[PDB]
Enzyme design. Structure first.
Site, PDB file in Angstrom:
ATOM      1  N   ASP A   1       0.767  -1.245   0.000  1.00 37.87           N
ATOM      2  CA  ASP A   1       0.000   0.000   0.000  1.00 37.87           C
ATOM      3  C   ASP A   1       0.800   1.299   0.000  1.00 37.87           C
ATOM      4  O   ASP A   1       0.366   2.282  -0.594  1.00 37.87           O
ATOM      5  CB  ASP A   1      -0.926   0.034   1.213  1.00 37.87           C
ATOM      6  N   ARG A   2       1.934   1.329   0.694  1.00 39.03           N
ATOM      7  CA  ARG A   2       2.551   2.615   1.026  1.00 39.03           C
ATOM      8  C   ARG A   2       4.053   2.709   0.772  1.00 39.03           C
ATOM      9  O   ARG A   2       4.828   2.831   1.717  1.00 39.03           O
ATOM     10  CB  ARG A   2       2.283   2.951   2.501  1.00 39.03           C
TER      11      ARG A   2
ATOM     12  N   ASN B   1     -12.203  -4.618   8.883  1.00 42.33           N
ATOM     13  CA  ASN B   1     -12.146  -4.637   7.427  1.00 42.33           C
ATOM     14  C   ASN B   1     -13.232  -3.748   6.846  1.00 42.33           C
ATOM     15  O   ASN B   1     -14.045  -3.181   7.580  1.00 42.33           O
ATOM     16  CB  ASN B   1     -12.287  -6.062   6.879  1.00 42.33           C
TER      17      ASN B   1
ATOM     18  N   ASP C   1     -16.548   2.430   7.955  1.00 45.69           N
ATOM     19  CA  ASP C   1     -16.197   2.071   9.326  1.00 45.69           C
ATOM     20  C   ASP C   1     -15.347   0.805   9.244  1.00 45.69           C
ATOM     21  O   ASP C   1     -15.860  -0.260   8.915  1.00 45.69           O
ATOM     22  CB  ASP C   1     -17.465   1.849  10.178  1.00 45.69           C
TER      23      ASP C   1
ATOM     24  N   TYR D   1     -12.794  -0.557  -4.689  1.00 48.80           N
ATOM     25  CA  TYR D   1     -13.237   0.755  -4.206  1.00 48.80           C
ATOM     26  C   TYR D   1     -14.281   1.399  -5.118  1.00 48.80           C
ATOM     27  O   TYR D   1     -14.326   1.132  -6.317  1.00 48.80           O
ATOM     28  CB  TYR D   1     -12.038   1.697  -4.068  1.00 48.80           C
TER      29      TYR D   1
ATOM     30  N   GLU E   1     -13.093   6.181   7.714  1.00 52.37           N
ATOM     31  CA  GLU E   1     -12.026   6.100   6.720  1.00 52.37           C
ATOM     32  C   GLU E   1     -12.574   6.360   5.322  1.00 52.37           C
ATOM     33  O   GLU E   1     -13.730   6.032   5.034  1.00 52.37           O
ATOM     34  CB  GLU E   1     -11.330   4.728   6.748  1.00 52.37           C
ATOM     35  N   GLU E   2     -11.741   6.964   4.476  1.00 49.72           N
ATOM     36  CA  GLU E   2     -11.970   7.016   3.035  1.00 49.72           C
ATOM     37  C   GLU E   2     -13.356   7.524   2.647  1.00 49.72           C
ATOM     38  O   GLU E   2     -14.111   6.830   1.971  1.00 49.72           O
ATOM     39  CB  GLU E   2     -11.734   5.623   2.429  1.00 49.72           C
TER      40      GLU E   2
ATOM     41  N   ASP F   1     -21.170  -2.030   3.178  1.00 48.96           N
ATOM     42  CA  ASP F   1     -19.734  -2.269   3.304  1.00 48.96           C
ATOM     43  C   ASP F   1     -19.393  -3.640   2.714  1.00 48.96           C
ATOM     44  O   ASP F   1     -20.274  -4.359   2.227  1.00 48.96           O
ATOM     45  CB  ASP F   1     -19.277  -2.187   4.765  1.00 48.96           C
TER      46      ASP F   1
ATOM     47  N   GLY G   1     -18.182  -1.712  12.073  1.00 53.51           N
ATOM     48  CA  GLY G   1     -19.373  -1.474  11.262  1.00 53.51           C
ATOM     49  C   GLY G   1     -19.419  -2.018   9.842  1.00 53.51           C
ATOM     50  O   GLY G   1     -18.424  -1.999   9.122  1.00 53.51           O
TER      51      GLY G   1
HETATM   52 CA    CA Z   1     -16.332  -2.456   8.045  1.00 52.39          CA
END
Ligand code: CA
Ligand SMILES: *[C@@H]1O[C@H](CO)[C@@H](O[C@@H]2O[C@H](CO)[C@@H](O[C@@H]3O[C@H](CO[C@H]4O[C@H](CO[C@H]5O[C@H](CO)[C@@H](O)[C@H](O)[C@@H]5O)[C@@H](O)[C@H](O[C@H]5O[C@H](CO)[C@@H](O)[C@H](O)[C@@H]5O)[C@@H]4O)[C@@H](O)[C@H](O[C@H]4O[C@H](CO)[C@@H](O)[C@H](O)[C@@H]4O[C@H]4O[C@H](CO)[C@@H](O)[C@H](O)[C@@H]4O[C@H]4O[C@H](CO)[C@@H](O)[C@H](O)[C@@H]4O)[C@@H]3O)[C@H](O)[C@H]2NC(C)=O)[C@H](O)[C@H]1NC(C)=O
Ligand SMILES: *[C@@H]1O[C@H](CO)[C@@H](O[C@@H]2O[C@H](CO)[C@@H](O[C@@H]3O[C@H](CO[C@H]4O[C@H](CO[C@H]5O[C@H](CO)[C@@H](O)[C@H](O)[C@@H]5O)[C@@H](O)[C@H](O[C@H]5O[C@H](CO)[C@@H](O)[C@H](O)[C@@H]5O)[C@@H]4O)[C@@H](O)[C@H](O[C@H]4O[C@H](CO)[C@@H](O)[C@H](O)[C@@H]4O[C@H]4O[C@H](CO)[C@@H](O)[C@H](O)[C@@H]4O[C@H]4O[C@H](CO)[C@@H](O)[C@H](O)[C@@H]4O)[C@@H]3O)[C@H](O)[C@H]2NC(C)=O)[C@H](O)[C@H]1NC(C)=O
Ligand SMILES: *[C@@H]1O[C@H](CO)[C@@H](O[C@@H]2O[C@H](CO)[C@@H](O[C@@H]3O[C@H](CO[C@H]4O[C@H](CO[C@H]5O[C@H](CO)[C@@H](O)[C@H](O)[C@@H]5O)[C@@H](O)[C@H](O[C@H]5O[C@H](CO)[C@@H](O)[C@H](O)[C@@H]5O)[C@@H]4O)[C@@H](O)[C@H](O[C@H]4O[C@H](CO)[C@@H](O)[C@H](O)[C@@H]4O[C@H]4O[C@H](CO)[C@@H](O)[C@H](O)[C@@H]4O[C@H]4O[C@H](CO)[C@@H](O)[C@H](O)[C@@H]4O)[C@@H]3O)[C@H](O)[C@H]2NC(C)=O)[C@H](O)[C@H]1NC(C)=O
Ligand SMILES: *[C@@H]1O[C@H](CO)[C@@H](O[C@@H]2O[C@H](CO)[C@@H](O[C@@H]3O[C@H](CO[C@H]4O[C@H](CO[C@H]5O[C@H](CO)[C@@H](O)[C@H](O)[C@@H]5O)[C@@H](O)[C@H](O[C@H]5O[C@H](CO)[C@@H](O)[C@H](O)[C@@H]5O)[C@@H]4O)[C@@H](O)[C@H](O[C@H]4O[C@H](CO)[C@@H](O)[C@H](O)[C@@H]4O[C@H]4O[C@H](CO)[C@@H](O)[C@H](O)[C@@H]4O[C@H]4O[C@H](CO)[C@@H](O)[C@H](O)[C@@H]4O)[C@@H]3O)[C@H](O)[C@H]2NC(C)=O)[C@H](O)[C@H]1NC(C)=O
Ligand code: 6PY
Ligand code: 6PY
Ligand code: CA
Ligand code: CA
Ligand code: CA
Lengths: 388, 388, 388, 388
Positions: free
Chosen positions: C70-71, C266, C213, C324, C196-197, C244, C217
């Protein structure tokens, strides 16, 4: 925008500096570089660009096989940014054909491409990226034109054409265009006996074209054109410093009004700057083949049949292949004078290097300096072995 | 458009943030990326771009073999979009040669390229993409210049040149150009004993250049130029924090007026920002070779021969290859201060990695922050094994 | 040019039409296409473009090995023309880093990239292609942001950030920028428990962000932002239509103020359009993995914890990989309403397809129609076997 | 900018000159050239460009396998500079789909793409690079349109669509757009019995479309459209010079109001210029397959069921593959007349050349001359063996 007028004289030429070089064959060994030949350079008011006849294939492409051939349906005049190589992705197609000229008149660019079979060719005249006028073959024998830039004055852009034999008398015409439209044409007059591939430049005295005599001459014919009266004259460079190729050795008396003999049915496109004591001639170093290139300062070369070099500069070593050369200038530069420029085609591949099956080239280009600059030499730089 | 004036001071430098990175060698493993070296960065009023000396071949190209060589006829200054890699298809040729500088004066860009053999080199000065002035070698020994951007004030753009020995006294000149024309030049004065490859920036106090002493010094010479009076002075960075490479270990007393000894006949292009308590020095981490890179906050480094670091930031780990570094700023950014920036050349290939036959590089670039930002390290990132 | 204001409501969404698709992986099998992930789309007043985080290597390049990571330091936010693939030669670098957002305010574009190690990351805020402001990590645990476009109103562009645990309580901040400068930031308030995101869009009622989440979530948290008062609130989508991934099966009662349980640690970036009876939710078809994609019309999904689909459209078959998804709109289109749009990332390679050593993606994008259009499905279309 | 009006008549057509040629397949043998089919040409006020339906893969790419297929999700309408080939790096995506038309109205360009499954296709109408209107299938049987440029008058741009059987009666509609919005549509009227792939041009008398009858006809249906009244009529070309393919031999009496019989359930997109004594028809030379191409001067061909050729020009030899052909004109050229132009698709690969697994094409294009120019022939020029 206004039409450009030729209001300046040439800058004093005391040496030549590097202007551009694209290293096309080196780069094309591993990049999508188009196979070309017959390159030149030409300026817009805001940009100067490289030009050439593509062969409609990249060098590494399998269709590069056979590109020694001059006149296929897969050829086109392309242009691309100065000193970039001619790639599939950065090349702009100006028109379709296998013989061309191009020039900007200050408002828009005129481009001309000739296509067709040998006995049925035609020129299409583009202006501002649109087709405007067309000219059919008048001698049914490879209608052909300059292969370097034309020159304009107050919208009027003369272009030299030839139709007919490459090895005898031919039908040469000077066309006068404005915004792509035909204003006038005239048959060749003067003492030049054969005309091909004129290299032209403009200055306050008018437009001067240095061409090739492919029939009997190894001195270069010259056409001088008045773009206002739309008339011209012709002769040869009087100087015994001979600048065709192949060619005899330099005599001590040249010829003003007739071909200098010794080599028949051949030649190379070349150029000169004819400007009294500020005169410089370009030529291959070899007298036998298209190798090496040098500039020679030859005072009054045009009119003096005894004139000899008083200064020079090597551009390409004799050990390295050259090819066509021609004139261009940035007519939209600042200052009180036009800076003389030229390009040299560096041919690689066939016929001289036949371990490969292609023929292509790269470009090197110089402009004049008022300084007396040190000289280098400028090879194509590619290693043929890498292509095997 | 008006000429830019240097009316601001440097922004407070509390850390460095990532500005650009092109990952050229990584990408060039499988793309038409040109072989380069001696890169830098320079801004126009509407765009900032990467610059470098191409070698006229791609990395995967077979002509990449031998590109450790510094001065061929196949080199050219190219520019390309910020953090893009230098590809055959996106690179703009600025001029032809193997040593260069470039800068925008607010109206147009001046670019300078030097070409020729060692004993007969010449500089060509381009302005607004046209050749304007030329300078012949004055010492017949590798005429050479900055290899990073120049700086302008009210149309006047000074440039530092050197001609002569790399291992002894040489002839350094400061040229002052406007619209590419030579206004004035002067011989080097002050206490700097040898000058190469100056990295310059401008601020309200004038123009500051941090150069390389290739003869006896491992402290960096500094040239300070008044672009209005068109005069200069020179000395060395007084600080005992030595920033050449290779170099001795840091002493506790530096030298202001003479080379700090220990390493002869070598060096690397580098830079600094000399701004009282806001002073930061760049250097390789290794004292022996071009590896690693760090910024060090060294208050009054220019004038204080006892000055030591009070803050720092690692840019490249010592385990990773670096190379040349130099200064640039976006003089057309908004705000009340000039934000200091620099690039680091990340050299890959020869001589240090000789399993490949080429030498190239990629670029990483940082600008200053008024925040105290966390630090990362920025390797070239290519795996040499992939090229075998 | 003036700052854009959010003066319109959403167009009535009766179906979705194809907007863009770049077929990047198909084309990249034999072209210099950059490895990417985390793509999105964003419009300027005169152009809409694709965006993504490059991995600084092409797919066929050997450095594609390991791009599941990823980074790295080799990542950058790039943009390229709509439905073109992201190539080495047509991609514009916006900034350097491995988490990003970007948006145009009507005058100029703001782009934000985060880089650095996990415990020392920083954001750099670019405006009009220049770095303007910087933000250091405040929780020393992977400072990260939206991975899709931000939204502006009268020059003010809010952006959601998160710093801290991916598997527990974290520190989320809403930043308010104008011309890249920080006007204000605030800590997350409301009932959302992890953020996030965020995928955001703007309309006359304000700015709406649908996030992820990642902690407990499987319903999506929502942040609603007033860009004038520069304040916000948060909750979850009340609907039992869970969006999600991975996620439990749809219940009949959702949760407005707390994570809906069943799947921990996740999630996937996603989006919605929350507009009363004009509400549409996007989600993967699979509840287990990132495969398939569908739009569901769920009236009052935001506030109705019993709401169910009354209409739908398949975008990607469950048999095909997705990834995504996020929101964008052309705020500079003609007409009286904003046309809702979204993209879906189609991930190929690892971890799901591990016969190759890379991870990349292509893009498909749809916008809403007031017609009831027939539906197709839109696979990435590449055959993995071709890469072996 | 103002909407263009059709105020001129056709230029006198005395021959045809080369306008463009991209040599796409030749170049694509070793370059990143996209697989295409169904090409055409269309002009903006400042530029003329090539158009085609990409297959979302390069020719050398392994995904070229199977590109004989007509309607995948990986297709898109692309445009690229005149006589350049369609490369990954120079192609602009206009919209997504597998059937298209496009035209500029003098202010902005309208582009239309149809996508979807056979029973659920939809058209998306783009204007000024933004989606504006959508049309759902009305017969649930491959909604399809022109595959060459549309024509506009005072902002109004008619487009012919067909939905329904390819081998029986179908539902043809003429849509009238302005700035991408639907002003009006109408069902096909007149005596044409089946309509596909209309090739259109505009002149002071209105808009003329020459289409294909795929059901029973080998004469070409004609639709004549009044763009002001937004009404139309239809018939067939009366001439016994038949111009579909495959087709019967030329009789001596044609058919004005019914399909000329002999060949069922097939055809090729073609074109004509119908202008009294200035009428020219295009057709393949072969009556059996898509090979060769010729222009024939057939006075009053539209209305005279006895009309025969009085002049002609070969464009492509019968020995060479051709394909689709269509009309376009530069409505923004200077002068007092519209210069008729056309393109010919040169299909290579399957089904006729099945040693390769792909199907693609290149483009050749001609415009009319008032001169009587010599003719050449214009092959694609690629050697299939090179691809094996
Ligand atoms: Ca989740
Ligand atoms: C760093 O760079 C600088 C800058 O480039 C270098 O300096 C340059 O050096 C080059 C190489 O030497 C020079 O080029 C040559 O120039 C000469 C002309 O200059 C000489 O002759 C002048 C004329 O002299 C005559 O007239 C005057 C009138 O008053 C009279 O005084 C005199 O007695 C004589 O009657 C002289 O004025 C001139 O002197 C000046 O310059 C000197 C420096 O050059 C300086 O020292 C002096 O103080 C004074 O200031 C000088 O003596 C060209 O003739 C020559 O071109 C010929 O030679 C090359 C081979 O080198 C050849 O390729 C050419 O084609 C040509 O030779 C052919 O053509 C002739 C004419 O037809 C023919 O006669 C020859 O036999 C030969 O023909 C054969 O070959 C051709 C080609 O294959 C074939 O076609 C034929 O058939 C046949 O086979 C060079 O161009 C530059 O001028 C010079 N530039 C400057 C600014 O100095 C410097 O060297 C570099 N530094 C280092 C360390 O490398
Ligand atoms: C997240 O990111 C942040 C932001 O980047 C990270 O924080 C950064 O951390 C780095 C690494 O530690 C720091 O860089 C170093 O900075 C020091 C200077 O700071 C120290 O010294 C200051 C000066 O102290 C002296 O003067 C004061 C004056 O009042 C006096 O009080 C004091 O007693 C002493 O007399 C101190 O002020 C300073 O304290 C402050 O900062 C602390 C945090 O750093 C903080 O805790 C304190 O409370 C206070 O606020 C601090 O103590 C540099 O000296 C250092 O550079 C040297 O070391 C590196 C190796 O790490 C080396 O490469 C450098 O070249 C240099 O060392 C050489 O040069 C010296 C000078 O000649 C020489 O003496 C050395 O022996 C050495 O020489 C050898 O090596 C070279 C190179 O090969 C060779 O040429 C020679 O010949 C010889 O072989 C670092 O630059 C950042 O400043 C810091 N930034 C911030 C904002 O905090 C954070 O760590 C990250 N977080 C995580 C979790 O990773
Ligand atoms: C050409 O193209 C056109 C245009 O696209 C095609 O037409 C489209 O066809 C598709 C496919 O059928 C439709 O999508 C589905 O829509 C339904 C919703 O519509 C139905 O239900 C409506 C609501 O009914 C309820 O409320 C009303 C309120 O009055 C009440 O009257 C009624 O009795 C009932 O109480 C109806 O209004 C609606 O009728 C209308 O539309 C009909 C046509 O659709 C028409 O014939 C009627 O006359 C009337 O006009 C219709 O009955 C969605 O429910 C459905 O989405 C579910 O199903 C898909 C699988 O197909 C699934 O992936 C979805 O996630 C969802 O199913 C999950 O979620 C549910 C909610 O939580 C759950 O209950 C399910 O059990 C299921 O859950 C499981 O799977 C998920 C996913 O893995 C998992 O997460 C869970 O945990 C669990 O495992 C579709 O979206 C389009 O709406 C329709 N469009 C149009 C304009 O017609 C046409 O077919 C094409 N032609 C050809 C030839 O191909
Ligand atoms: C350099 O370039 C120039 C410029 O291009 C070249 O000059 C060109 O040369 C070409 C080739 O010859 C010409 O194209 C042909 O044109 C003829 C039409 O012209 C002839 O007929 C005219 C009409 O005559 C009739 O009406 C007049 C009315 O007054 C009457 O007087 C007369 O008696 C007769 O009743 C004549 O006016 C015309 O004369 C003029 O032009 C002469 C030069 O051409 C000149 O010498 C004269 O002085 C005068 O000025 C001339 O006689 C087309 O008919 C022909 O097209 C047919 O033939 C080709 C094969 O070549 C074929 O592919 C075509 O499809 C077509 O043939 C089919 O269709 C017919 C109609 O249905 C049918 O009847 C045929 O049987 C045939 O059908 C079969 O094949 C098709 C196709 O597969 C299939 O579908 C069917 O089912 C069936 O199987 C050519 O187009 C150019 O016009 C000409 N241009 C110019 C400006 O001169 C020059 O040659 C080049 N130079 C060199 C050295 O190469
Ligand atoms: C005995 O040496 C004589 C030739 N060596 C030399 O000139 O090297 C110089 C520079 O070195 C390096 C380097 O990486 O160290 C890269 C540059 N390469 C460029 N193409 N610009 C060099 N500059 C030049 C004009 O070649 C050095 O500064 C000594 O003068
Ligand atoms: C039984 O046939 C049903 C499917 N065949 C079909 O539709 O073919 C049509 C067109 O044919 C050709 C061709 O080269 O002949 C190329 C075009 N390809 C495009 N991608 N546009 C085709 N159009 C479409 C929408 O696919 C034909 O006109 C019959 O309707
Ligand atoms: Ca000759
Ligand atoms: Ca040194
Ligand atoms: Ca038919």
């Amino acid at each position: 925008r206004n039409f450009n007028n030729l209001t300046k004289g040439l800058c004093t030429i005391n040496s030549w500096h590097i202007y551009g070089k694209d290293n096309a064959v080196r780069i094309g060994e591993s990049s999508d570089v188009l196979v070309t030949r017959e390159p030149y350079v030409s300026c817009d008011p805001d940009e100067c660009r490289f030009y050439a006849l593509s062969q409609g294939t990249t060098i590494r492409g399998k269709h590069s096989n056979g590109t020694i051939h001059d006149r296929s349906q897969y050829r086109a005049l392309i242009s691309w940014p100065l000193s970039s190589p001619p790639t599939v992705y950065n090349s702009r197609v100006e028109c379709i054909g296998w013989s061309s000229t191009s020039c900007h008149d200050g408002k828009s660019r005129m481009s001309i491409c000739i296509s067709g079979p040998n006995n049925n060719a035609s020129a299409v005249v583009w202006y501002n990226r649109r087709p405007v006028a067309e000219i059919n073959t008048w001698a049914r024998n490879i209608l052909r034109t300059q292969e370097s830039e034309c020159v304009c004055h107050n919208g009027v852009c003369p272009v030299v054409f030839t139709d007919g034999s490459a090895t005898g008398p031919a039908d040469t015409r000077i066309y006068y265009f404005k915004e792509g439209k035909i204003l006038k044409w005239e048959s060749l007059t003067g003492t030049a006996k054969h005309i091909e591939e004129c290299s032209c430049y403009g200055e306050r005295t008018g437009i001067t074209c240095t061409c090739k005599d492919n029939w009997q001459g190894s001195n270069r014919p010259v056409i001088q054109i008045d773009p206002v009266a739309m008339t011209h004259t012709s002769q040869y460079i009087c100087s015994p410093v001979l600048t065709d190729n192949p060619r005899p050795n330099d005599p001590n008396i040249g010829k003003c009004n007739d071909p200098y003999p010794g080599n028949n049915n051949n030649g190379v496109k070349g150029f000169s700057y004819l400007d009294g004591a500020n005169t410089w001639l370009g030529r291959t170093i070899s007298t036998a083949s298209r190798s090496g290139y040098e500039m020679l300062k030859v005072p009054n070369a045009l009119t003096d049949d005894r004139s000899k070099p008083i200064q020079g500069q090597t551009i390409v070593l004799n050990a390295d292949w050259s090819g066509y050369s021609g004139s261009f200038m940035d007519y939209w530069a600042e200052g009180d004078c036009y800076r003389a420029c030229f390009y040299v085609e560096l041919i690689r591949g066939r016929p001289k290097e036949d371990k490969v099956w292609w023929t292509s080239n790269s470009i090197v280009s110089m402009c004049s300096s008022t300084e007396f600059l040190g000289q280098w030499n400028w090879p194509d730089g590619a290693k043929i072995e890498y292509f095997l």
